[PDB]
């Protein structure tokens, strides 16, 4: 049944670094042969491609590091995902998944299987075990994995109820070593929930998936790319303001990269993560000094980065894009932001991928600053080269701020600033907003770390060994804010609440003209107004639209994890405990912007909740609609009756 | 009388940038002739030297910038000070002062006159008008001086009670321009009181005054140099911790100076203060690029700095000093810290001035980073080259931290860490300490800015024009702390209270081993204990021993300014309103260390309160006695019964 399919899906993720020792899994893997049948998949091309990869010494063996930002790794993972996705029936998909689990590389199998599960018509609504639990090596410092393995080695017969079911109290990166100050925001950048958010966003909309083939173009994906990255940057800026940090550092490709990253994580094969030192020179000569290369295109990541940056600048200035036809494509269309997002991201929907390329891929390779692989099968990728650990690197935020500057330039040059009438909602007036005291504190979070040790077959079958990891994760006391609206008739409005800063780290007031980009979508719902006075009450545990529209969320929770506050993986999901940025004992001061507008339903492609169905969104206004473009008159945003600015102090206790 | 002499002394300081238009002053200057008499001064050599300077085109004319860190400026100022000081009777001193006022350069006259007044036997107890009022061009941005001159130009007959007695609301450096972040602590570094403190300290113990000739060796001057600069650095560090800043930046002479200084002040001759840009190269070539020099020793300030730093390193490592005899002088004596202070400072008491030189002079010249003077009479000095504006430059604090590192090295290598017995005070026990809530806030301070404009003779005589400047200066609510001591007999003890940080800017606990240098002397008094329980009550308005022992203070206040909270100028004087570092709304957390010890009277050379008389001090223990040397066991300082650590939160309101 659906419950049994869910349980089997979860079973498939146990002890990924080891072969599946379940009897059914072993039998299925040893007896099944995808190429032998070759008829149960909707397409024979996908199976033929995967067979070509698998047989003729062009496949990533078990035990090798997998990176989705390496070309051949990506090609093989795509082939496996297509094999999983084009299974005519779920039974064939399960047999293929079991075989791949037992035979295909661990990281490659995990990525292909996850993308298939979120994207398959049948298994879209399947919950997935938290990634930080499945593959913990990417989420905890090696001082935690090594301690878990200490307990595992010591747990043998003697000393019962000792070295078992033990809680490892992990610290964040800067506890032991005095790492670079930017890594002081380690409890946020290295939070398992935030990295899970980024990883699940990339699972939902992979940078290599084509919107024509996989229906991701009905979700725009360019506006998604832009809005998701801008919201991540804005939430990071809010956290930095909380901790007294300033705006994210600006960096030049031609100046030594002033920031260094010292990861504390380790690969399951005993290989430590690459380290980027302070003031690292990013030039071909310096970042390939003392290396072989010769036929590695990533060795020249600097020249490719400069080329793609130049091309993006040119297309944004002109507003005219080059296509394979070499013709003139208008970028001023209604969906010009979408075209720009596809162009910059590098997804198969890019106007000309050969010309604009994957700027982010080469930027991550260069800023990761690790040795170029001697061979395909001997690769040493950095944090920036994985989705699960990208947010841990400050260079991640600096790189994507450099990217979003391009979108800001496009909007500034080609978008007309909103006037009073465009934002006006005649007959609606937000009288005042009351928000309960916003308090943020730290609490311990317990996660099943047992997947980081090597279990014996009996232990595997019975899960006898248990080892937890406890981590201080920011949490907030539940709050409920009220919105009072005085309408003129029974209209159907859309309410959009934003969270942004009012004062910078130096206490200076930030004008909306230089502050529109720092606003974080706090809630985005639809309310049916009535003539006269209305009161809108919203709880903290009812907000599912943080920095992202998730309208069909919680119906998947009520089914999969609804058989509380359990890692969803449904849509993207920002941690409910990280919604409010850390405050101060005195209370760092932010402001909430409340907006109300008439309903504009989105062009939903289909009713079924699914990636690419278009059912995600609330309204058809541009994402972050009031602040999606530069603001030329702050007093205009203050004077709108259907708007309201309200100031709150978030209090940190601990 | 004494009151009339005080009033005449104050009159001498009115409108320094202009000739004295008082009738008596003009008559005295025009009729008097110091060389004509040549007998009223105790020495004919001083008058002959000043005459040689004054006549034969080797004197600094009126209207030229004066810098005490220029060799020939310093020589001329010394000659004038010696002329003022060796006046056999006060009447001759007054006639000479009037003549110099009307004829000698303004800055040179002001410096020589002030040093003479603080150092003369007769006029030691004379109060002096606040320096920030006498010569405001060194204490306020030019946007204030130009506005005062606007009012002065507009104030002519018409528009009465308008453009007169006007209050100019001045802002600190970073209000208009987005200057380098280190200048964010502008309300402290640019506070008139703090700069007055430094200027008056340098008036009291000039770097060129000989302790043999002027009795400054009975005040050690080396321990004074060290302790004053260390306490200034520690108070600055406390302020930085308050504002979230860290430890003072360390800089290498061989790396570009990463910090830049943009002063907003202007010279009275319309010349703007030199600016040091970010990442300034300090090498001979770079900081003399495009300049003439050729016979300016300060052009090679870098080589001299390196030489003197090398010599200081060598003497501290060896502990053996080179003298004109070229012999071996023990630096391990009881007064070895004094010898080291004289050696580093460069005062005439230096063991061999030719060999160790004035490291601070050349360091200030190099870090000031201004054009080398084309001529003696055309000089463009920086903030670091004046005593009144040194503390405004972050390079000041970085330079003197680099200096005090030398003393730290000397103490670490050659001083034995205190044990339990050395610090023990048997029979004394500090039970607990109660300190009232420490609250710091901002208030407006009004200073007479009228000395920055050019008045007509009638206006000069009647002081018709009045223009004030209002500035937000940190102030604290009055507090009273209690110290409970349980003694065994009626002993006579010395109480030493220190203020230092407990947590750094990142919330980490600072161990005493790395925290002994950050403790600021809060109070240092003597109490006559009694057998059994004692309670010591001390008010905030009774503390005169902040970062400096001033035992004979307030008897000069009760006479000169006692005919409240008026700028003293007596001894050094840390502003009473800046005693408590700025807190936070949540409350930045510091700690008070309370120490009690048996009385060790200082070797007072004379009873009369005076510079060089030795009457300044309380006890004969080394300055900052508990923390004058590195701490090898913090638990030792915690375990001493006669000690006590108490934690306080200082609350910022505003």
mmCIF file of C-alpha atoms in Angstrom, chain B residues 44-161:
data_model
loop_
_atom_site.group_PDB
_atom_site.id
_atom_site.type_symbol
_atom_site.label_atom_id
_atom_site.label_comp_id
_atom_site.label_asym_id
_atom_site.label_seq_id
_atom_site.Cartn_x
_atom_site.Cartn_y
_atom_site.Cartn_z
ATOM 1 C CA UNK B 44 71.934 84.129 30.374
ATOM 2 C CA UNK B 45 72.419 81.086 28.137
ATOM 3 C CA UNK B 46 68.666 80.615 27.689
ATOM 4 C CA UNK B 47 68.087 84.249 26.729
ATOM 5 C CA UNK B 48 71.081 84.211 24.380
ATOM 6 C CA UNK B 49 69.788 81.053 22.688
ATOM 7 C CA UNK B 50 66.304 82.494 22.264
ATOM 8 C CA UNK B 51 67.767 85.740 20.902
ATOM 9 C CA UNK B 52 69.838 83.775 18.390
ATOM 10 C CA UNK B 53 66.692 81.951 17.291
ATOM 11 C CA UNK B 54 64.561 85.098 17.184
ATOM 12 C CA UNK B 55 66.821 87.474 15.262
ATOM 13 C CA UNK B 56 68.861 85.613 12.640
ATOM 14 C CA UNK B 57 66.035 84.328 10.436
ATOM 15 C CA UNK B 58 65.737 81.004 12.286
ATOM 16 C CA UNK B 59 62.394 81.573 14.009
ATOM 17 C CA UNK B 60 58.887 80.354 13.221
ATOM 18 C CA UNK B 61 56.876 83.415 12.205
ATOM 19 C CA UNK B 62 53.266 84.053 13.153
ATOM 20 C CA UNK B 63 50.709 82.203 11.053
ATOM 21 C CA UNK B 64 52.851 79.123 10.397
ATOM 22 C CA UNK B 65 51.825 75.660 11.532
ATOM 23 C CA UNK B 66 53.676 74.459 14.630
ATOM 24 C CA UNK B 67 54.384 70.791 15.351
ATOM 25 C CA UNK B 68 56.154 69.649 18.513
ATOM 26 C CA UNK B 69 57.357 66.558 16.624
ATOM 27 C CA UNK B 70 59.471 68.594 14.199
ATOM 28 C CA UNK B 71 63.058 68.943 15.335
ATOM 29 C CA UNK B 72 63.497 72.682 14.873
ATOM 30 C CA UNK B 73 59.982 73.508 16.068
ATOM 31 C CA UNK B 74 60.782 71.487 19.177
ATOM 32 C CA UNK B 75 64.123 73.229 19.696
ATOM 33 C CA UNK B 76 62.547 76.688 19.433
ATOM 34 C CA UNK B 77 59.672 75.719 21.729
ATOM 35 C CA UNK B 78 62.191 74.385 24.251
ATOM 36 C CA UNK B 79 64.144 77.640 24.095
ATOM 37 C CA UNK B 80 60.987 79.670 24.707
ATOM 38 C CA UNK B 81 59.878 77.383 27.540
ATOM 39 C CA UNK B 82 63.294 77.755 29.171
ATOM 40 C CA UNK B 83 62.989 81.528 28.824
ATOM 41 C CA UNK B 84 59.586 81.391 30.539
ATOM 42 C CA UNK B 85 60.687 78.932 33.229
ATOM 43 C CA UNK B 86 63.942 80.618 34.305
ATOM 44 C CA UNK B 87 62.259 83.945 35.063
ATOM 45 C CA UNK B 88 63.649 84.894 38.467
ATOM 46 C CA UNK B 89 60.340 86.474 39.518
ATOM 47 C CA UNK B 90 56.761 86.016 38.356
ATOM 48 C CA UNK B 91 56.570 89.606 37.085
ATOM 49 C CA UNK B 92 59.360 88.972 34.576
ATOM 50 C CA UNK B 93 57.627 85.748 33.554
ATOM 51 C CA UNK B 94 54.399 87.651 32.898
ATOM 52 C CA UNK B 95 56.152 90.346 30.864
ATOM 53 C CA UNK B 96 57.917 87.688 28.792
ATOM 54 C CA UNK B 97 54.632 85.826 28.316
ATOM 55 C CA UNK B 98 52.870 88.974 27.094
ATOM 56 C CA UNK B 99 55.701 89.779 24.692
ATOM 57 C CA UNK B 100 55.731 86.228 23.320
ATOM 58 C CA UNK B 101 51.940 86.287 22.975
ATOM 59 C CA UNK B 102 52.159 89.414 20.853
ATOM 60 C CA UNK B 103 55.260 88.409 18.869
ATOM 61 C CA UNK B 104 56.018 84.673 18.954
ATOM 62 C CA UNK B 105 54.186 82.043 16.907
ATOM 63 C CA UNK B 106 50.773 81.113 18.280
ATOM 64 C CA UNK B 107 51.258 77.364 18.653
ATOM 65 C CA UNK B 108 54.853 77.655 19.847
ATOM 66 C CA UNK B 109 53.895 80.294 22.407
ATOM 67 C CA UNK B 110 50.922 78.253 23.596
ATOM 68 C CA UNK B 111 53.002 75.103 24.076
ATOM 69 C CA UNK B 112 55.956 76.785 25.779
ATOM 70 C CA UNK B 113 53.690 78.865 28.021
ATOM 71 C CA UNK B 114 51.587 75.870 29.064
ATOM 72 C CA UNK B 115 54.589 73.672 29.835
ATOM 73 C CA UNK B 116 56.152 76.494 31.847
ATOM 74 C CA UNK B 117 52.931 77.089 33.785
ATOM 75 C CA UNK B 118 52.472 73.445 34.771
ATOM 76 C CA UNK B 119 56.195 73.131 35.544
ATOM 77 C CA UNK B 120 57.037 76.482 37.140
ATOM 78 C CA UNK B 121 57.425 76.475 40.953
ATOM 79 C CA UNK B 122 55.198 79.530 41.366
ATOM 80 C CA UNK B 123 52.432 78.880 38.820
ATOM 81 C CA UNK B 124 52.105 75.099 39.151
ATOM 82 C CA UNK B 125 48.717 75.528 40.855
ATOM 83 C CA UNK B 126 47.312 77.863 38.184
ATOM 84 C CA UNK B 127 44.285 76.566 36.322
ATOM 85 C CA UNK B 128 44.386 76.747 32.542
ATOM 86 C CA UNK B 129 41.452 77.399 30.198
ATOM 87 C CA UNK B 130 40.415 74.207 28.395
ATOM 88 C CA UNK B 131 42.626 73.533 25.392
ATOM 89 C CA UNK B 132 39.614 72.575 23.279
ATOM 90 C CA UNK B 133 38.335 76.121 23.886
ATOM 91 C CA UNK B 134 41.631 77.982 23.452
ATOM 92 C CA UNK B 135 42.632 76.358 20.144
ATOM 93 C CA UNK B 136 39.411 74.769 18.856
ATOM 94 C CA UNK B 137 40.778 74.108 15.360
ATOM 95 C CA UNK B 138 42.343 70.877 16.674
ATOM 96 C CA UNK B 139 39.154 69.608 18.344
ATOM 97 C CA UNK B 140 36.208 70.208 15.979
ATOM 98 C CA UNK B 141 35.616 69.432 12.326
ATOM 99 C CA UNK B 142 36.005 72.337 9.931
ATOM 100 C CA UNK B 143 32.246 72.223 9.344
ATOM 101 C CA UNK B 144 32.001 73.752 12.838
ATOM 102 C CA UNK B 145 34.734 76.379 12.495
ATOM 103 C CA UNK B 146 33.387 77.493 9.118
ATOM 104 C CA UNK B 147 29.879 77.764 10.579
ATOM 105 C CA UNK B 148 31.155 79.829 13.508
ATOM 106 C CA UNK B 149 32.875 82.103 10.994
ATOM 107 C CA UNK B 150 29.637 82.290 8.994
ATOM 108 C CA UNK B 151 27.918 83.592 12.112
ATOM 109 C CA UNK B 152 30.793 85.991 12.789
ATOM 110 C CA UNK B 153 30.673 87.445 9.272
ATOM 111 C CA UNK B 154 26.884 87.786 9.424
ATOM 112 C CA UNK B 155 26.886 89.356 12.921
ATOM 113 C CA UNK B 156 27.246 93.059 12.082
ATOM 114 C CA UNK B 157 24.759 95.496 13.578
ATOM 115 C CA UNK B 158 21.644 94.269 11.807
ATOM 116 C CA UNK B 159 19.743 91.189 12.964
ATOM 117 C CA UNK B 160 20.357 91.598 16.684
ATOM 118 C CA UNK B 161 20.012 88.542 18.905
#
